[PDB]
Amino acid sequence: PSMSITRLFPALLECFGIVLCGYIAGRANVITSTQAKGLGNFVSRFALPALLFKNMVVLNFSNVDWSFLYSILIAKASVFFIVCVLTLLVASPDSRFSKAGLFPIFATQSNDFALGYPIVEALYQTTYPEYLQYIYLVAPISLMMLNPIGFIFCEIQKWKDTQNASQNKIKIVGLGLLRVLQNPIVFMVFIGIAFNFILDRKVPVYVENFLDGLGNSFSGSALFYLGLTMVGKIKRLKKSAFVVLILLITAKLLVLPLLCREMVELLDKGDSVVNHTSLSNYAFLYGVFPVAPGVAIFATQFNMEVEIITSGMVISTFVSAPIMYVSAWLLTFPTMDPKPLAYAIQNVSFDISIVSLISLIWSLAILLLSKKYKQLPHMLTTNLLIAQSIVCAGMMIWNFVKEKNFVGQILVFVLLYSSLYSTYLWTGLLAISLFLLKKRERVQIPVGIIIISGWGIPALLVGVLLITGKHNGDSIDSAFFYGKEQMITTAVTLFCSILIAGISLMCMNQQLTRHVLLCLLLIIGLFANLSSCLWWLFNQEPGRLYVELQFFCAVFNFGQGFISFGIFG
Ligand SMILES: O=C(O)Cc1c[nH]c2ccccc12
């Protein structure tokens, strides 16, 4: 295929597993905040410049598609210009230049080497090997292009804050540019380009082992340091600052991908449809890379906007994981016929259910071992997390069982289906329990009946499904394993929970917020699945928007554990 999309989930597990290792290590103080700087110094002063130098010396410039460079750079320059001019118009006077510097750098500078390259490598190393070159071209040329302008605005702020020092523009410009030249990425690219020419792309045999040994250590070491620098970083922001952060992460993780993709489709006027397509898709995925950790370092160096930039970098890194996974698969679906596409959505479901189950077990354990599960609603909320866990656990088994045998398929189907419906009801059961708790303190909530229904009724619905329906189990999609009746069952379950929740939340309006938020964020997913099921039935020959909806309702179905992991973890 045009992109080895199956290799992305392992790459993301490498990337974000090692970031999680660093995060766990810093949390557990396996490495303290002052000890982490030793790893950071190694990463940035040795491993990264070695990696840059090696790849820049090796690079065949007579094989670079400059259109991709110009496309991504013009897209980054666009987002930079937009965020800069918009920041200059929106922000308040005494902070507008610090923000106009760092917010555009934020919105454009990608976590290219640590996170981007493992992902690009996995996706494209075998299908389109030259796509790995553009990491080392785009990322540094991006700094040389755009970072000096942002630093110039930060130097304007440093100048303006220092009202004793109404000094020269030449110093402002020069110092901004000097900070760009002092960046190891920038100067090791200049140095590597010089030795690309001097050596005719040949790393000396007796220097190669060194550059290999240092450079190859970068990814793991940098991803680990990234985890360590994410510990204790998401400070409680003002509502205004949180909205700004959402808009900046939207610029980096949505707008920049869309503009990158558009620019490749504008400028890659070359002939090949499939090469144009894969390059376009690579441009989108390039745009989805997180904010580079270096932006937080610049912010610290200036002492400017540091909470927003650090928190945004942290959140951007984590938000890039699902967006990147989701986007890459979504872009790949137009290349797939309906059977490998059904396989694809089950693979997606399995992948998400793994990491969601892990998030769920963690969140469950926290709520249990904190003894939060004693309180109401938190006991039923823990049951909602239990419900989500059994959903994810079932889907993992269906991937193992999809070709095993008829009986195991049915049994595994019982489990997955039933937990699937149990989540649906616990959405509603929680929501009406919120109303019941809100109604008056003298009301004793019918916890036992609620639990018995929250698992009996889903078991009953799967029993009904087995009885009234028939085995459609030749079908790869487990949500279609029992066909028309299955999706009607799904639809009724969701609608019941939706009515229960809407009515109860209404009466409740006429601890609480996190559970209301949970129910609503589940309800948008329940409606995604409700839509999916009636649409399935009738469409009969569903379009591209259906496989994308099928995909996003699968992302919800199994990724809803991450919702719980955010709300209570
Ligand atoms: O953004 C990048 O990929 C480069 C980078 C520079 N210093 C870093 C520290 C940790 C992780 C990545 C980087």
State the distance from the centre of ligand 1 to the C-alpha of 43, rounded, in angstroms: 8
72 ligand 1 Cβ < 6 A:
no
Cα(219) to ligand 1 centroid in Å equals: 9
Residues 326 and 417 in one domain: no
How many C-beta atoms lie closer than 10 Å to residue 537's C-beta? 13
Query: Of the candidates 333, 352, 384, which is a domain's last residue?
Result: 333
CB 52 within 8 A of CB 136: yes
Sequence-ordered list of residues with C-beta below 8 angstroms from that of 402, at least 6 positions apart, any chain: 346, 409, 476, 478
Domain containing 531 — which CATH number? Answer: 1.20.1070.10
* Residues β-bridged to residue 291: 110
Q: Which residue range is the domain that position 402 belongs to?
A: 338-567
What is the domain-level CATH number for residue 253? 1.20.1530.20
Resolution for this PDB entry, in angstroms: 2.8
Q: Are residues 325 and 344 in the same domain?
A: no
Q: How many domains does the chain have?
A: 2
* CA nearest ligand 1 atom 9, residue: 222
Q: Are residues 247 and 344 in the same domain?
A: no
96 contact partners, CB below 8 Å, separation of at least 6: 87, 88
In contact, 68 and 51? CB cutoff 8 Å: no
Sign of the torsion angle spanned by Cα atoms 45, 48, 50, 53: negative
Among 281, 310, 333, give the residue marking a domain's end.
333
- Say how far apart CA 463 and CA 455 lie, in whole Å: 12
Interval between CA 293 and ligand 1 midpoint (Å) = 5
Residue 60: helix, strand or coil by DSSP? coil
Place of tokens 């892990």: 358
556/413 Cα distance (integer angstroms): 19
CA angle 360, 365, 371 (to 5 degrees): 130
> Cα 196 from chain centroid?
35
Same domain, 47 and 87: yes
- Claim to verify: residue 91 and residue 145 sit in the same structural domain: yes
CB atoms under 10 Å from CB of 160, counted, come to 15
Q: Are 274 and 297 in contact (CB under 8 A)?
A: no
Instruction: Note whether 468 and 390 are same-domain residues.
Output: yes
**Angle at Cα 535 formed by Cα 533 and Cα 541, nearest 5°?**
115
Backbone angles phi and psi of 110, in degrees to 5 = -95, 155
Strand segments, DSSP code E, in 257-347 are: none
- Are residues 114 and 213 both part of a single domain? yes
Please work out whether the CB of residue 112 comes within 6 Å of at least one atom of ligand 1.
Answer: yes
CA–centroid distance, 113 to ligand 1, in Å, is 6
Token readout for 492 is 């009724």
Tell whether 112 and 172 lie within a shared domain.
yes
Q: Considering only CA atoms, which of 209, 91, 568 is closest in space to residue 372? A: 568
Same domain, residue pair 308 and 385: no
Cβ–Cβ < 8 Å for 180, 147: yes
CA 70 from centroid of its chain's CA atoms: 26
CA atoms within 13 A on the CB side of 7: 14
Residue in 23, 55, 113 to alter for ligand 1 test, most ligand atoms within 8 A of Cβ: 113
At a CB cut-off of 8 Å and minimum separation 6, what does 260 contact?
71, 72, 75, 76, 283, 284, 286, 287
Q: Are 272 and 392 found together in one domain? A: no
Helices (H), 447-482: 447-468
Token readout for 535 is 């649409």
Task: With H, G, I as helix, E, B as strand and everything else as coil, classify residue 110.
Answer: strand
C-beta of 111 in contact with ligand 1 (< 6 A): yes
Q: Are 433 and 445 in contact (CB under 8 A)?
A: yes
Q: How far is the CA of 446 from the centre of ligand 1 (A)?
A: 53
Last residue of a domain, one of 285, 308, 333: 333
Any ligand 1 atom below 6 A from CB of 225: yes
Question: Are residues 179 and 271 part of one domain?
Answer: yes
Q: Which helix (H) or strand (E) covers residue 356, if one does?
A: helix 338-369
Which atom of ligand 1 is nearest to 40's Cα? 9
Say whether both 227 and 365 belong to one domain: no
Nearest residue (CA) to ligand 1, atom 10: 222
The Cα angle at residue 310 between residues 309 and 312, in degrees rounded to 5: 65
Contact 221, 42 (CB under 8 A): yes
Q: Residue 110's beta-bridge partner residues? A: 291
Q: Which residues are annotated as a binding site for cholesterol?
A: 9, 23, 232-234, 514
Nearest-atom number in ligand 1 for the CA of 229 is: 10
Question: The tokens of 149 are what?
Answer: 């302008």
